[PDB]
Amino acid sequence: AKLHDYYKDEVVKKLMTEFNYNSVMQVPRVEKITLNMGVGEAIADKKLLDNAAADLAAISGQKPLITKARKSVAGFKIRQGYPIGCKVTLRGERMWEFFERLITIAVPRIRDFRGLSAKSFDGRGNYSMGVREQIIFPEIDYDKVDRVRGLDITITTTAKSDEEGRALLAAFDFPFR
Amino acid sequence: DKKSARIRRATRARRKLQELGATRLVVHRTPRHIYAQVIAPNGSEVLVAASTVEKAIAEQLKYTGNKDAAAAVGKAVAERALEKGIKDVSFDRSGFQYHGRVQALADAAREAGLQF
Amino acid sequence: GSTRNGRDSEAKRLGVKRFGGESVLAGSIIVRQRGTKFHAGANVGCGRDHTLFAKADGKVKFEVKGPKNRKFISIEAE
Amino acid sequence: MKKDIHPKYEEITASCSCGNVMKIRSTVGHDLNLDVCSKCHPFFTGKQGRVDRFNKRFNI
Amino acid sequence: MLQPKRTKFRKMHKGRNRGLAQGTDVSFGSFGLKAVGRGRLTARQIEAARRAMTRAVKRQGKIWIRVFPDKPITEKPLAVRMGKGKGNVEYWVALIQPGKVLYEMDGVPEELAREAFKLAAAKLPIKTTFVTKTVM
Amino acid sequence: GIREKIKLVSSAGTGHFYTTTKNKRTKPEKLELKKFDPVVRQHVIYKEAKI
RNA sequence: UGCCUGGCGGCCGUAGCGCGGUGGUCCCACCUGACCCCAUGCCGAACUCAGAAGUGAAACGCCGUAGCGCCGAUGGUAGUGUGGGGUCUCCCCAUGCGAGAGUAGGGAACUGCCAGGCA
RNA sequence: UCCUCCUAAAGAGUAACGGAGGAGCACGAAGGUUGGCUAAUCCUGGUCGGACAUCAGGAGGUUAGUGCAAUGGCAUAAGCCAGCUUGACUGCGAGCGUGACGGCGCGAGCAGGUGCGAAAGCAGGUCAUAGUGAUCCGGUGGUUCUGAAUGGAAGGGCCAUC
RNA sequence: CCGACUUACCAACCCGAUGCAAACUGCGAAUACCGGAGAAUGUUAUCACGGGAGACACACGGCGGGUGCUAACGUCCGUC
RNA sequence: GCGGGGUGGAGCAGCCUGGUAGCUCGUCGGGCUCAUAACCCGAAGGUCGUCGGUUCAAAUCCGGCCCCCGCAACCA
RNA sequence: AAAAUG
RNA sequence: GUCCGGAUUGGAGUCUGCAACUCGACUCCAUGAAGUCGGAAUCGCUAGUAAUCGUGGAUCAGAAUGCCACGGUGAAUACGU
Numbered sequence A: 001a002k003l004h005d006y007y008k009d010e011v012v013k014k015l016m017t018e019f020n021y022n023s024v025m026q027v028p029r030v031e032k033i034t035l036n037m038g039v040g041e042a043i044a045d046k047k048l049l050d051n052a053a054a055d056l057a058a059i060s061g062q063k064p065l066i067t068k069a070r071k072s073v074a075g076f077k078i079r080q081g082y083p084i085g086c087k088v089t090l091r092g093e094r095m096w097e098f099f100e101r102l103i104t105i106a107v108p109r110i111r112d113f114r115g116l117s118a119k120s121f122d123g124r125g126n127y128s129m130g131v132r133e134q135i136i137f138p139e140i141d142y143d144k145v146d147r148v149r150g151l152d153i154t155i156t157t158t159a160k161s162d163e164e165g166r167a168l169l170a171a172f173d174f175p176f177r
Numbered sequence B: 001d002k003k004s005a006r007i008r009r010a011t012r013a014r015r016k017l018q019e020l021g022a023t024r025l026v027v028h029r030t031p032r033h034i035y036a037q038v039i040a041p042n043g044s045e046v047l048v049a050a051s052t053v054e055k056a057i058a059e060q061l062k063y064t065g066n067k068d069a070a071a072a073v074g075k076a077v078a079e080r081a082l083e084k085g086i087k088d089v090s091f092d093r094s095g096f097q098y099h100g101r102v103q104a105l106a107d108a109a110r111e112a113g114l115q116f
Numbered sequence C: 001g002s003t004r005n006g007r008d009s010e011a012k013r014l015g016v017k018r019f020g021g022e023s024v025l026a027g028s029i030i031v032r033q034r035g036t037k038f039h040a041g042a043n044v045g046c047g048r049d050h051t052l053f054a055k056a057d058g059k060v061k062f063e064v065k066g067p068k069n070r071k072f073i074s075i076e077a078e
Numbered sequence D: 001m002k003k004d005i006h007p008k009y010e011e012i013t014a015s016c017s018c019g020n021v022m023k024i025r026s027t028v029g030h031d032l033n034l035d036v037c038s039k040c041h042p043f044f045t046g047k048q049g050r051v052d053r054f055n056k057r058f059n060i
Numbered sequence E: 001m002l003q004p005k006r007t008k009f010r011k012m013h014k015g016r017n018r019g020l021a022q023g024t025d026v027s028f029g030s031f032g033l034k035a036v037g038r039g040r041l042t043a044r045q046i047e048a049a050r051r052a053m054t055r056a057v058k059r060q061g062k063i064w065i066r067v068f069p070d071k072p073i074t075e076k077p078l079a080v081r082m083g084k085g086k087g088n089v090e091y092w093v094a095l096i097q098p099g100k101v102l103y104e105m106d107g108v109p110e111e112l113a114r115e116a117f118k119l120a121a122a123k124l125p126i127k128t129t130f131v132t133k134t135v136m
Numbered sequence F: 001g002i003r004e005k006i007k008l009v010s011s012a013g014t015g016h017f018y019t020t021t022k023n024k025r026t027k028p029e030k031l032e033l034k035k036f037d038p039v040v041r042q043h044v045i046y047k048e049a050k051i
Numbered sequence G: 001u002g003c004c005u006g007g008c009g010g011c012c013g014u015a016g017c018g019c020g021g022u023g024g025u026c027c028c029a030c031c032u033g034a035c036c037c038c039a040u041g042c043c044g045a046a047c048u049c050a051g052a053a054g055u056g057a058a059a060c061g062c063c064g065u066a067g068c069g070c071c072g073a074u075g076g077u078a079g080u081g082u083g084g085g086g087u088c089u090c091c092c093c094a095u096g097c098g099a100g101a102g103u104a105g106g107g108a109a110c111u112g113c114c115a116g117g118c119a
Numbered sequence H: 001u002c003c004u005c006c007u008a009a010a011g012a013g014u015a016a017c018g019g020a021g022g023a024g025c026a027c028g029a030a031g032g033u034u035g036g037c038u039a040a041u042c043c044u045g046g047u048c049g050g051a052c053a054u055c056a057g058g059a060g061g062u063u064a065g066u067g068c069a070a071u072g073g074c075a076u077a078a079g080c081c082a083g084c085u086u087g088a089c090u091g092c093g094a095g096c097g098u099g100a101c102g103g104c105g106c107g108a109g110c111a112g113g114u115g116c117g118a119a120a121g122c123a124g125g126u127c128a129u130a131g132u133g134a135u136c137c138g139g140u141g142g143u144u145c146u147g148a149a150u151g152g153a154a155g156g157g158c159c160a161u162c
Numbered sequence I: 001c002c003g004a005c006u007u008a009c010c011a012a013c014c015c016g017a018u019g020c021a022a023a024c025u026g027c028g029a030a031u032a033c034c035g036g037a038g039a040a041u042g043u044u045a046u047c048a049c050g051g052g053a054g055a056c057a058c059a060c061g062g063c064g065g066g067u068g069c070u071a072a073c074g075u076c077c078g079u080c
Numbered sequence J: 001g002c003g004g005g006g007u008g009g010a011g012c013a014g015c016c017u018g019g020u021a022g023c024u025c026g027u028c029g030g031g032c033u034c035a036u037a038a039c040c041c042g043a044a045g046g047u048c049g050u051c052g053g054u055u056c057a058a059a060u061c062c063g064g065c066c067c068c069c070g071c072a073a074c075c076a
Numbered sequence K: 001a002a003a004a005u006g
Numbered sequence L: 001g002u003c004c005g006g007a008u009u010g011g012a013g014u015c016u017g018c019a020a021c022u023c024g025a026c027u028c029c030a031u032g033a034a035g036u037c038g039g040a041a042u043c044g045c046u047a048g049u050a051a052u053c054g055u056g057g058a059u060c061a062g063a064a065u066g067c068c069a070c071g072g073u074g075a076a077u078a079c080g081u
Ligand SMILES: [Mg+2]
Pocket: none
């Protein structure tokens, strides 16, 4: 809970000063981090989806939830209810630990990392970023890797706007370019 | 919301109890307090009531929002109902699960003699 | 020439059988309907085909009740 | 958390070359030997035309 | 020739044509041609009248057509007996009631508008009259 | 018309049977249900059998 | 008796949205932990439990505000039962019934029971 | 032949070789119950990933959904999910609807036995309305009800069913 | 790679204005129909059961309609 | 009126039973030949008559138009 | 085996 | 598809030449394509030949994988018509 204790001990005060909030409850919070793997290659091979789930479990520390097609789509040859991905919702202690591991270990291991886009906010202070290769997480062993897979990471926050979301993330020294 | 979803969860049973003309034992639960009301079939007259906001019950309790306080309220409301001679009510869980504090209240009201 | 048309089904004799104020015996059908165009009120049952029938002797009463301004049928005791 | 279905999640030590050590819970199982970390990566730290070269090569 | 691009149903009951019209005011231009009689305006008649008035003004100003022929009219072929199903759609009409403003025009003097509307009226099966925008 | 008629025979030995239908191709497994046997006046297991 | 709050109803937009302001002693809400009772097709988010450091930020309640929604005359108009008439595809007259839309206007709900806090 | 809408004139019914569509099934779960849940579509952000997969948020508010036509319903959902299940029970049935009739439909409640629920309760199939075939003749099981001198038997009856 | 301008032009959604519908309805009559009450009137005019039928080719006119050409002394319903 | 059709340049399949376009010729490129043909090797070429609809999805199912074929279009 | 033409 | 292959491209140079943009050769660093033995068809070769390996010369300021020439290693097979 290093980053949560840092949030409470420093980031709250910093944001209160920076935005002049009238109550401490008004400070943006990091609510949840969701990791998503869109596994379209599972349409023909189910071991692909199972291996994606194993990668996600290794990375996040949580057994993932297999997601299924909401509607049938000819364009991707998918019928309704077909499992085509996996996600994990990280909250609380697990979420702060993953935030720390991401920031301090995984992002530094991104090939040719020149800084995360600061425009990748959804308009309400929530940040999403892509990963192209799961090896950037040390939990994934390099010489056991079957297929190259990435994932999506979303950080949902209680920020009313993108500027407050970016300030909240920057307070953790998020690697914004 | 949370209250809206709970009212929605409560409506089916409440309309059934109204259609049956049952005398209703209504429970309300908050993080800090539990409440019980016995409401006449017309739904708009409260016959008896007990709650952890009344000092006569709050004074004997370590904390008003746990299962022991729920048990005390259930016993108190059943005792009052039997003083006014009711003895036949239907339990309305008000969209709360039948579990935990609500179940402790309902069981204590039963043990005190209320029939439901 | 001919027609692709020319078909229909038997009329189902739906509708109101006992109107407001009529005195009915328990079991009497008050309305035959498709779905709950009318809803069951006090002393009125709703059958599997949404037929509304008296569950008590008394007088039919049509009312509009509830937040959706829906029509209800009750039997009022004589 | 549901029992008996999640990966093993226990603390390890991440040792970077620059001498940074972080104690992090992980599913990796063993200790880590990082080649880089947030405290030493060039982008994190801050460590990241023709007339000039024409004059340098053709000095008169 | 005006005609609905699509319709729910191909064929329509004959129906009747009682009542007074809706849309009895010059609502878009400054002058109007208003029906005094009752009847059916066919698509060809509406087009013929529009061409007459449009050429009269030498395509100056603006013209509105306030009626649309949305009622399909069927006919049985020659040498066909009665029955054997409804006839085929042959043309489209707008039902017209007294008071209906049929055409409107702006951007011309009243004197040219009356001439143009008179030339148009001659193509129409229903009696018409020249009207002007009112304040209320 | 793929569903075929079957009988559910009382396990109580009374010979009493219900009848119902079954899609035999998609559900080859024997239908088994607890149903009232009016002869012994109890709920007993009923087993599928040919009509 | 009055103000405030909670629960259950009456009623079912004159009652609902939007906008501006406002309140935490109590109540309510967020909230704090979670081995637990119980729970997540992953996640204490929800459900649940054990609580009370913090805040009314959100939610909610209250007050104000017509940009809306909503309600809504009078008069006229449409239709129409009966009887009569015409130039009869449609109309008119006597008499009875009389809209819809729109107009003036109204309008920021009202109310019963029980319980709690404050005066 | 059957179902839905209009014609049909605001109760029911109402014709034409009038205007338009459907059925001749499906389902041991898609039935019962208890607990829970809430749609379409668009916008923004997000590895591969694109107009369209999965993820996050917002807008929206049922424009979705309903095993299959159309109409009437449906949020207390009748729509979506899960647990446990067999009420898709047997004998009856106040009363009522609809038919010239044969018939067809709706039904509280009573007896027995049952499932779900802590409980009030709910359950006699399915959101409802199509998914159907009289009688004769015979087949199968059950039941001595009958049994042509008598005991049986055959055959018949009755009940279930083809 | 990107892209910069401009259209004889086309143009969704939204907003404002204008019509149309048997199979449209956020509205909605007159009548008609069902039920209740009360007088007057009417040779019970009502209902049940039983004996005897005939009839089941309709026509025109009015009103509301389908069909036909708001053609027919046309055709098919409703009602007088 | 009732049946049957319209698919590379030509002639034929595929439809029924929706997902997944085949055969022969011809065309092109290379080869054999002095050269051409024959012969040999290797490729390309319909996007399914036209508009709509149903569908997650159409050559395929449905409806309408255009074109093409078969029959039938009688009794006085 | 087949084996045309200029 | 490699410590095979060395095309292509970026950067930095050298030299000849008045002058290397079109359009030179060579060097260094980096890059690291096709290609895993080639369809129908088709060529050369009978001995110091074929195959393979280097070397030199003319033309020529510079500019050979061409041409002309030189050695080293050094086969297989020819029943036969
Ligand atoms: Mg909480």
